[PDB]
């Protein structure tokens, strides 16, 4: 196994993987690594047991068809993932936490919106159909970038927001197009 975090890339308290080498801080790992199971296996793993089983989920996708699906098991994994590929980016930490807007000349947005929400609302059962998931986290950059303006620092909301997509058409499969 790896001596760091897949995550956040820091050692400490490490769970190890049993059918890859990757290791995870417990609330690192989205779900948060599981009390007993031995074997365990990652989210990584699983998600690729996903694609092994059924080779055809790889074909091109609508993302209008993606979003409409129930939230049962697989998407439910799916979002979980998705959710952990932006925790893996650095630049993730300007949208952990609850965010306050206090800038002049502008006001803050309506419904905010930031990763560790999405995260418990995940956690809670909260989302009925991928939709809601993806929504919030649209919601998350779009606030930014309208909050900070012609602020240099919106560039920070493209960013992440470019790994959130790029991680989406990936995870669910969405039919590549010019
Ligand atoms: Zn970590
Ligand atoms: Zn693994
Ligand atoms: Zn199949």
Redo the contacts with the bound molecule.
Sequence with gaps: NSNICEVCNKWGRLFC??????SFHEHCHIPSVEANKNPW?????RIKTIQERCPESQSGHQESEVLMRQMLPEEQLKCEFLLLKVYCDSKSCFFASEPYYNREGSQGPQKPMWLNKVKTSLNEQMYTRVEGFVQDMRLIFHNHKEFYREDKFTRLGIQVQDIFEKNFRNIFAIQETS
Aim: proline fraction near 9%; hydrophobic fraction near 20%.
């Design positions: 993987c049993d059918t890859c080498p990757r296996s990652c989210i990584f793993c």
